[PDB]
mmCIF file of C-alpha atoms and ligand atoms in Angstrom:
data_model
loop_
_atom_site.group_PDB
_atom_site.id
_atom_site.type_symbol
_atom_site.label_atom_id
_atom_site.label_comp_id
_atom_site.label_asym_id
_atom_site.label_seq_id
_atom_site.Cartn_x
_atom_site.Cartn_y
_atom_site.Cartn_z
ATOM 1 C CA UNK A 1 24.146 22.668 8.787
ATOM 2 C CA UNK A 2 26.498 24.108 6.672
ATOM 3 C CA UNK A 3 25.125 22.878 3.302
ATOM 4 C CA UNK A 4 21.476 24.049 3.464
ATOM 5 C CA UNK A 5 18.850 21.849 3.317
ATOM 6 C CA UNK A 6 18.978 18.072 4.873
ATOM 7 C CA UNK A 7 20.468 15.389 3.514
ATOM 8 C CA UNK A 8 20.165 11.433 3.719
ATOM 9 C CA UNK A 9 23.616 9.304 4.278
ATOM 10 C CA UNK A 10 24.401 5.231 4.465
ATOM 11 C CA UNK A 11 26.826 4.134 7.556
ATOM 12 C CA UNK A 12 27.539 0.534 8.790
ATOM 13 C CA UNK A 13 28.284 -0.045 12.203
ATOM 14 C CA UNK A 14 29.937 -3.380 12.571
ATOM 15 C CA UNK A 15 31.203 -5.274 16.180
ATOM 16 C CA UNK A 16 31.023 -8.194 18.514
ATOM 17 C CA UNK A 17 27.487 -8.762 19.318
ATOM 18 C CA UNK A 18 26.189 -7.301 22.339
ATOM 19 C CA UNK A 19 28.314 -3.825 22.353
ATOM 20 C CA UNK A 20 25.557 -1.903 21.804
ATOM 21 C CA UNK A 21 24.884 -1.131 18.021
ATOM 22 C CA UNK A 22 21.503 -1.097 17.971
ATOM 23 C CA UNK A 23 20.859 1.241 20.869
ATOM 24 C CA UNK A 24 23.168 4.659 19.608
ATOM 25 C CA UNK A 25 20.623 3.752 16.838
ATOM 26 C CA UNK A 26 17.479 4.903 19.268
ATOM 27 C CA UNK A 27 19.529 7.738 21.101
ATOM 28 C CA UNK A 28 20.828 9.495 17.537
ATOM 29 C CA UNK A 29 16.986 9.504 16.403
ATOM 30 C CA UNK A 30 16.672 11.167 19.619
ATOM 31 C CA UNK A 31 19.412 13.726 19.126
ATOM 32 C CA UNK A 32 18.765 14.701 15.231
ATOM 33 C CA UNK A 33 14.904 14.710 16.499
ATOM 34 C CA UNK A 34 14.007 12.802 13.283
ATOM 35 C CA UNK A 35 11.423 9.655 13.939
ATOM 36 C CA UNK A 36 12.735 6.263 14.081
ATOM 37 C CA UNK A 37 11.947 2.567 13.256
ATOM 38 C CA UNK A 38 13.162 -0.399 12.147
ATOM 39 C CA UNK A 39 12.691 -3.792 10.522
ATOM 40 C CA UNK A 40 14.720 -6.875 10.383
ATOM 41 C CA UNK A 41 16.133 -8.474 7.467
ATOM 42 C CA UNK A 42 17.574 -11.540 8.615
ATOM 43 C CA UNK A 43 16.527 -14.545 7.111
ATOM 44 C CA UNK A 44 13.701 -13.515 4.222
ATOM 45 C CA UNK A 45 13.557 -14.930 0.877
ATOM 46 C CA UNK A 46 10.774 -13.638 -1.396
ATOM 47 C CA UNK A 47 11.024 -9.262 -1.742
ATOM 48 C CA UNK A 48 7.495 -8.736 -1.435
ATOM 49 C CA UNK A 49 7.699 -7.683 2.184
ATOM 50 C CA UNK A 50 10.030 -4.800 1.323
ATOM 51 C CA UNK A 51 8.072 -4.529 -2.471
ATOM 52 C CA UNK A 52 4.335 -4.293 -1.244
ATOM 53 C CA UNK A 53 2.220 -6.563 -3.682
ATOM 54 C CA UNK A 54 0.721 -5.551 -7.030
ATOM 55 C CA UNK A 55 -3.060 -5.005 -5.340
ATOM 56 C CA UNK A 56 -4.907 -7.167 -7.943
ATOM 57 C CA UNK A 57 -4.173 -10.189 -5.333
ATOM 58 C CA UNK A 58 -7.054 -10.048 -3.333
ATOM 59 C CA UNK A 59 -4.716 -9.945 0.172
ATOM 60 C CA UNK A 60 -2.056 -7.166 -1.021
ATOM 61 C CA UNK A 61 -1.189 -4.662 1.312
ATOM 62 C CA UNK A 62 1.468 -2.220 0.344
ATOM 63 C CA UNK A 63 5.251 -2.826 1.444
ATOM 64 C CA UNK A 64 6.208 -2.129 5.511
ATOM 65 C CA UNK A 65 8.605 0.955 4.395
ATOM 66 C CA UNK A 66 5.297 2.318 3.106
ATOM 67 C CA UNK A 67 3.279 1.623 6.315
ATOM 68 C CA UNK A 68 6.221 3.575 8.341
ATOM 69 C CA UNK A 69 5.661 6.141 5.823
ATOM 70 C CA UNK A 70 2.043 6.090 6.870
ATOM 71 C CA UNK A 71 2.923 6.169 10.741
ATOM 72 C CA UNK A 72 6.115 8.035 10.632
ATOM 73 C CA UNK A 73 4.760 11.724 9.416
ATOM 74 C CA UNK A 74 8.474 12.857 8.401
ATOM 75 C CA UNK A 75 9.220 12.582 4.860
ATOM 76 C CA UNK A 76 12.622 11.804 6.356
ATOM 77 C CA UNK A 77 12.417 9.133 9.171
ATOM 78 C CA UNK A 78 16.129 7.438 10.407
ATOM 79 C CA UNK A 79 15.088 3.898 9.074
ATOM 80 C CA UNK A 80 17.274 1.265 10.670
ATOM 81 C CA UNK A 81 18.432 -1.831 8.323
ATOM 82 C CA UNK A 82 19.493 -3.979 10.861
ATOM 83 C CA UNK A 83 21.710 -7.862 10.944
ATOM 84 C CA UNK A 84 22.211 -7.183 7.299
ATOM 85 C CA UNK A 85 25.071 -9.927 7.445
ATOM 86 C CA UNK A 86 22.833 -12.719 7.981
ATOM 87 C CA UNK A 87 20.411 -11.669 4.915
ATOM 88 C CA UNK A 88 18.104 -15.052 3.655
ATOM 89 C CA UNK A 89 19.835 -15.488 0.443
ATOM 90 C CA UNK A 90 18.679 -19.314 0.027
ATOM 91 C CA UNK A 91 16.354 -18.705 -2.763
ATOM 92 C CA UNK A 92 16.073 -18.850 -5.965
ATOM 93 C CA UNK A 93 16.778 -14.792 -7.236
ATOM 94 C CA UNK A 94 18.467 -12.927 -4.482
ATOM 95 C CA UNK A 95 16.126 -10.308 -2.860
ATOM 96 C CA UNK A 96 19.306 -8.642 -1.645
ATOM 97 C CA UNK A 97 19.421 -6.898 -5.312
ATOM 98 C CA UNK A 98 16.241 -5.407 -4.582
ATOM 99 C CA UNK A 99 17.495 -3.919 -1.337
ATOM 100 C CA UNK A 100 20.228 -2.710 -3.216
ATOM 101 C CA UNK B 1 -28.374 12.811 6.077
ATOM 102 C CA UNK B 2 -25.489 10.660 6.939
ATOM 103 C CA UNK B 3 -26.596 8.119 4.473
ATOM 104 C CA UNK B 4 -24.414 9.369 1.925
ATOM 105 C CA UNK B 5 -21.741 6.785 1.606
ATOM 106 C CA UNK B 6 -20.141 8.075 -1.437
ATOM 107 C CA UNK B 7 -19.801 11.892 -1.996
ATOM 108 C CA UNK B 8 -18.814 11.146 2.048
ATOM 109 C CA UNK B 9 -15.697 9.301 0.644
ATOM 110 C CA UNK B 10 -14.464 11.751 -1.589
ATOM 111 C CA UNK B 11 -14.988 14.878 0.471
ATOM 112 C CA UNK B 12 -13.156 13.027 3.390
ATOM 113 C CA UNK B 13 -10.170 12.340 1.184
ATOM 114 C CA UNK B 14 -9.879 15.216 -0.539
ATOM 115 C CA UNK B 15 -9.804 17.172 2.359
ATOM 116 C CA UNK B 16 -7.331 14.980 3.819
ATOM 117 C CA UNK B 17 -4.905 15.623 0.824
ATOM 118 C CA UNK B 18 -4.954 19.330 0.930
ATOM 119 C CA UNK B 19 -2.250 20.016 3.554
ATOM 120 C CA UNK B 20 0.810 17.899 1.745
ATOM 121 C CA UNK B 21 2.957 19.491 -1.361
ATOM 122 C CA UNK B 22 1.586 17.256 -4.213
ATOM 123 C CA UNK B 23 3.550 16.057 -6.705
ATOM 124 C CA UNK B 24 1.810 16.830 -10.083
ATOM 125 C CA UNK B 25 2.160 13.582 -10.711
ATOM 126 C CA UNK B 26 0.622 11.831 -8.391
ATOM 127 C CA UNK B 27 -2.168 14.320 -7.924
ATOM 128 C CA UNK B 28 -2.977 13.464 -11.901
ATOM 129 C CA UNK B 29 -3.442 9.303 -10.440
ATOM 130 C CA UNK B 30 -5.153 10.558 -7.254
ATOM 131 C CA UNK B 31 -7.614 12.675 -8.941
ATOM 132 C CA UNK B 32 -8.698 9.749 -11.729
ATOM 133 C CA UNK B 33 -8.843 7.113 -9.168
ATOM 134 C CA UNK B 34 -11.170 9.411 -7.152
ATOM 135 C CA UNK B 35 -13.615 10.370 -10.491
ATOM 136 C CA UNK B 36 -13.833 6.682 -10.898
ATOM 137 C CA UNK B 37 -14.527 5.520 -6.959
ATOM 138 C CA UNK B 38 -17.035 8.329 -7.145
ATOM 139 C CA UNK B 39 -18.952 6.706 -9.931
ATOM 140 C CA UNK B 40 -18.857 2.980 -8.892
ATOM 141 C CA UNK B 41 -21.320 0.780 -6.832
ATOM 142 C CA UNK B 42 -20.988 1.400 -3.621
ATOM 143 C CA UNK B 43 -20.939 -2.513 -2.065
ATOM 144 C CA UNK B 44 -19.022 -4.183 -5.500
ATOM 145 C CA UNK B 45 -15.435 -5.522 -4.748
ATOM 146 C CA UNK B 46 -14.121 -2.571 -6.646
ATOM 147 C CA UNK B 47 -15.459 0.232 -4.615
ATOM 148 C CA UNK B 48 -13.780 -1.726 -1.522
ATOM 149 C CA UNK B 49 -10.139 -2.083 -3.318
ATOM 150 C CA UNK B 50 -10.340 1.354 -5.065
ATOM 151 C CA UNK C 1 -8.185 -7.002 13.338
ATOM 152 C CA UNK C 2 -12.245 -8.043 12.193
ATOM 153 C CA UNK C 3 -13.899 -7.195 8.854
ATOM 154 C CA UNK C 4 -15.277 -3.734 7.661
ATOM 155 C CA UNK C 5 -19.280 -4.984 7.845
ATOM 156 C CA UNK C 6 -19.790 -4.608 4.312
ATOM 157 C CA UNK C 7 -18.035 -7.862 3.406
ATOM 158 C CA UNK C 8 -20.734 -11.527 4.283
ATOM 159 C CA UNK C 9 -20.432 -12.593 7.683
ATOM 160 C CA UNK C 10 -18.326 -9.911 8.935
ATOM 161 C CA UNK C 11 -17.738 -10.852 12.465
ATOM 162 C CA UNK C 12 -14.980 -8.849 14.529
ATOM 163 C CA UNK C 13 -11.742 -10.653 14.968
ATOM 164 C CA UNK C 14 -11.211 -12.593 17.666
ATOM 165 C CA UNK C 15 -10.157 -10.542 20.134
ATOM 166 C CA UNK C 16 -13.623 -8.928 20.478
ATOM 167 C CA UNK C 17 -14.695 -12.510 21.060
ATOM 168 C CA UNK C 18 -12.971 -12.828 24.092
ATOM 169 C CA UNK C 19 -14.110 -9.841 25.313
ATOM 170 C CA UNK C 20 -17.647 -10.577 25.166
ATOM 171 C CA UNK C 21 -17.715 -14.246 26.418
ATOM 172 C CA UNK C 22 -15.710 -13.260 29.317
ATOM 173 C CA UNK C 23 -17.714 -10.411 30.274
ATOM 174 C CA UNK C 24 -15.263 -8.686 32.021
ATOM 175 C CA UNK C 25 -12.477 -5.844 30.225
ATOM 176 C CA UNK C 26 -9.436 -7.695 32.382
ATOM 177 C CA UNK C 27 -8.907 -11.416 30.645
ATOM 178 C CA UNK C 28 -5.520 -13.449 30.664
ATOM 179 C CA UNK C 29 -5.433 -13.483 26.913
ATOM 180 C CA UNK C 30 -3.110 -16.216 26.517
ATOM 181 C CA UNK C 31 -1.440 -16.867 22.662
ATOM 182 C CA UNK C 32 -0.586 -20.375 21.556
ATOM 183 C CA UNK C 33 2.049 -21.742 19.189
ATOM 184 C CA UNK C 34 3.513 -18.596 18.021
ATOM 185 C CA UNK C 35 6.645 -20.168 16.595
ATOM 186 C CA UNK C 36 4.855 -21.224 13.591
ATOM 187 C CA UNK C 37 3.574 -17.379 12.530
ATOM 188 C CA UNK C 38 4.072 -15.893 9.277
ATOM 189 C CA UNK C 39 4.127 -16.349 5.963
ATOM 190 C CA UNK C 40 0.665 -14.919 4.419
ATOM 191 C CA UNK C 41 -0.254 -13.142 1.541
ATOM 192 C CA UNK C 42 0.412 -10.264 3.876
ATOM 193 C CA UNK C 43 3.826 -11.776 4.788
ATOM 194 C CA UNK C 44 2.510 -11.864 8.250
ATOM 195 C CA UNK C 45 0.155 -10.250 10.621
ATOM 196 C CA UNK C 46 3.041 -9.844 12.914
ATOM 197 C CA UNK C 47 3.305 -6.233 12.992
ATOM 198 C CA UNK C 48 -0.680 -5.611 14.066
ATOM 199 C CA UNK C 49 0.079 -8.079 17.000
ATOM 200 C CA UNK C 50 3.230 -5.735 18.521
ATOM 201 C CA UNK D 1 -25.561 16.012 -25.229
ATOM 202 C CA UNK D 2 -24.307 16.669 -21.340
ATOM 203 C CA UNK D 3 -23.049 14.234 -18.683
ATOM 204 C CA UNK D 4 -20.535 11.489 -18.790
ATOM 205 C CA UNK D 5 -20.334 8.302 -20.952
ATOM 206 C CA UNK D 6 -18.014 5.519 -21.326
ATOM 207 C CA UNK D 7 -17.392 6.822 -25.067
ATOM 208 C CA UNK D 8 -15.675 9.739 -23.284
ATOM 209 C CA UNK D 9 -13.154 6.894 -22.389
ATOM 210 C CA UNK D 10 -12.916 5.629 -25.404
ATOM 211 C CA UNK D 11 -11.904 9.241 -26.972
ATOM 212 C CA UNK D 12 -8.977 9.544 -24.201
ATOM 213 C CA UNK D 13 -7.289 6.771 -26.016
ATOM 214 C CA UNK D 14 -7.691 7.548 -29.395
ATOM 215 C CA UNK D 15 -6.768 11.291 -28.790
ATOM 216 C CA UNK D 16 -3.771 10.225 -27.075
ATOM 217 C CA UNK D 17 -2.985 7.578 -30.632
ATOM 218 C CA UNK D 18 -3.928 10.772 -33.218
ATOM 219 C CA UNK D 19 -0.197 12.442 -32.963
ATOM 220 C CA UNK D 20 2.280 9.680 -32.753
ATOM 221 C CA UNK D 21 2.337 8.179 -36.407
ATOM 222 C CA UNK D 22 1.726 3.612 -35.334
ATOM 223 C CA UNK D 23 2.412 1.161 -37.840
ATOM 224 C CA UNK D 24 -0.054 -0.759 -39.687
ATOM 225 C CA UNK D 25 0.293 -3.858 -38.118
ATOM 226 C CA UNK D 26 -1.039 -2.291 -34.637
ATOM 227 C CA UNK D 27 -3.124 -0.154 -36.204
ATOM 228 C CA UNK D 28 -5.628 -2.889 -36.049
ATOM 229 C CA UNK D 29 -5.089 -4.861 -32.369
ATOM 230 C CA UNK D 30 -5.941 -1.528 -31.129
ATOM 231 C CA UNK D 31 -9.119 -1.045 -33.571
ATOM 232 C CA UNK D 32 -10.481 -4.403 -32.554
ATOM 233 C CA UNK D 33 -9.766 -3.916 -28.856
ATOM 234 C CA UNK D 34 -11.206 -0.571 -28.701
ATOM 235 C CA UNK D 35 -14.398 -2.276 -30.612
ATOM 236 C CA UNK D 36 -14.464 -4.796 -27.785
ATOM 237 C CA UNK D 37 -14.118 -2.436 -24.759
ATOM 238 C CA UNK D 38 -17.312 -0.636 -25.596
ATOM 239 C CA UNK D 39 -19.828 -3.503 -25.443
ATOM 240 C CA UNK D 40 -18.329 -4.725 -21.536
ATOM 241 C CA UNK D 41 -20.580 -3.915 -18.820
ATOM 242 C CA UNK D 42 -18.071 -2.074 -16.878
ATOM 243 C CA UNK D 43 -18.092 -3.906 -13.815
ATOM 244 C CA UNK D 44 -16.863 -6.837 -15.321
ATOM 245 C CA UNK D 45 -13.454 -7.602 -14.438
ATOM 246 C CA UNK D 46 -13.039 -8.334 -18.088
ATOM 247 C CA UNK D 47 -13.394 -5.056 -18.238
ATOM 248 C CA UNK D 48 -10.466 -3.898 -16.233
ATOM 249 C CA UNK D 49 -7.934 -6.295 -17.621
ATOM 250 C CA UNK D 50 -8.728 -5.080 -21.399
HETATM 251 N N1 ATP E 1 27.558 1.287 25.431
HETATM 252 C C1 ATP E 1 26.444 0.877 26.057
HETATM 253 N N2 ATP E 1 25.950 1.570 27.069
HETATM 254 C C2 ATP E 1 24.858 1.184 27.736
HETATM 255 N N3 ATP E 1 24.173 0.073 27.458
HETATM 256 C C3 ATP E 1 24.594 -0.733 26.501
HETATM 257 C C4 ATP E 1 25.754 -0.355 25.730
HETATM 258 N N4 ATP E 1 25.917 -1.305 24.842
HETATM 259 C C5 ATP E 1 24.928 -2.201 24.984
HETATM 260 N N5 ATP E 1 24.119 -1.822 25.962
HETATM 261 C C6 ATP E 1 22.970 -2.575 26.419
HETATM 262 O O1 ATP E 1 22.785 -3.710 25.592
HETATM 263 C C7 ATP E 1 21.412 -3.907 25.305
HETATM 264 C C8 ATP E 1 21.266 -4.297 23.849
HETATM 265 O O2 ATP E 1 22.379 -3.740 23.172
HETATM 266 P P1 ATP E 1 22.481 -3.912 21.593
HETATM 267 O O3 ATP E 1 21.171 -4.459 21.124
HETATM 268 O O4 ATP E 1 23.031 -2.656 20.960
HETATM 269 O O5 ATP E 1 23.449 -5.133 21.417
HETATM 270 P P2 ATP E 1 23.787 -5.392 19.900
HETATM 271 O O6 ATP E 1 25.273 -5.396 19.793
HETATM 272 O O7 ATP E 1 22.915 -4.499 19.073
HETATM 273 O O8 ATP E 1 23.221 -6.855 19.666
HETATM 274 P P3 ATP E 1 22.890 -7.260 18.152
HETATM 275 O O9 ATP E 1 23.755 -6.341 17.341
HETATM 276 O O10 ATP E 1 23.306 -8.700 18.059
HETATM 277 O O11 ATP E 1 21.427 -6.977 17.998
HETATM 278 C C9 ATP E 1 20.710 -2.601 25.600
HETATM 279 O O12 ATP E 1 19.694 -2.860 26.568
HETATM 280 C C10 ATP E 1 21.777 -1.704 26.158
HETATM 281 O O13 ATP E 1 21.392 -1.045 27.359
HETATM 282 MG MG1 MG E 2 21.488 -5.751 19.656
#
């Protein structure tokens, strides 16, 4: 409020599973009336699902932080990273240097 | 006539641009890719991805 | 979620399916050996099925 | 003479080429693939890849 116009941030929450990280997630959306959603990261290997596809492929279909672009409305939705700690790292070429 | 199936599709997205702040940018990409969708087949495989 | 009728043999997905062999807008819809989902060239249809 | 022609597309290019001084060597990969793009039926996807 103080310096004009909105601005984005980064924060990491971090406890004992089960103390309730995920829903102050749901109830701040509420209180800064921006739109919400989420997507896991646990587990993946290949980047395409946060990189969309290059659309000669016959099957592409652009990345899901597009697609909550497309349902979200808000330029500015409170996307929610979430179990970061446990990203799928196996594979060859990390995709965790695309998320960063 | 509804049978239009063409000048349809770019009147529909057009007008469904107009409301947003357009980059320049983008509007130069949008604007090509809808000269050349408004020229093409309407059943061919590129009509359908375009 | 079915094909847009423009594509060969474009029959709605399957869902519509069940609707029309059991003739009635209430079925038990029952899904089968989820655990193995995932995976496409779309990464998975997951999403559309929440 | 009015209305549109592929040559139009051709002229983009070689408008966009006429300021920036290219070497020799590319001088001609360009020439010959210019050549090319002209006889393509458009449609092909040769076409889109050149
Ligand atoms: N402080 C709290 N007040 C009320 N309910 C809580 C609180 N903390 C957790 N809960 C309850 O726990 C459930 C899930 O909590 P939450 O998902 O935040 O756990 P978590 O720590 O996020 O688990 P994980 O981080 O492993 O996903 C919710 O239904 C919520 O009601
Ligand atoms: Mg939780």
């Amino acid at each position: 409020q103080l310096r004009g116009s909105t601005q984005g941030k980064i924060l990491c929450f971090y406890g004992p599973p089960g103390v309730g990280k995920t829903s102050i997630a749901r109830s701040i959306a509420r209180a800064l009336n921006r739109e919400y959603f989420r997507f896991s990261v646990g587990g993946m290997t290949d980047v395409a699902e946060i990189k969309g596809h290059r659309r000669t492929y016959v099957g592409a279909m652009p990345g899901k932080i597009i697609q909550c672009l497309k349902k979200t409305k808000t330029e500015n939705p409170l996307i929610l990273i979430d179990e970061v700690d446990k990203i799928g790292r196996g594979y060859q070429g990390d995709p965790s240097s695309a998320l960063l | 006539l509804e049978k239009d199936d063409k000048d349809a599709i770019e009147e529909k997205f057009r007008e469904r641009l107009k409301e947003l702040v357009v980059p320049k940018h983008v509007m130069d990409v949008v604007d090509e890719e809808l000269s050349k969708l408004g020229l093409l087949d309407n059943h061919s495989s590129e009509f359908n991805v375009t």
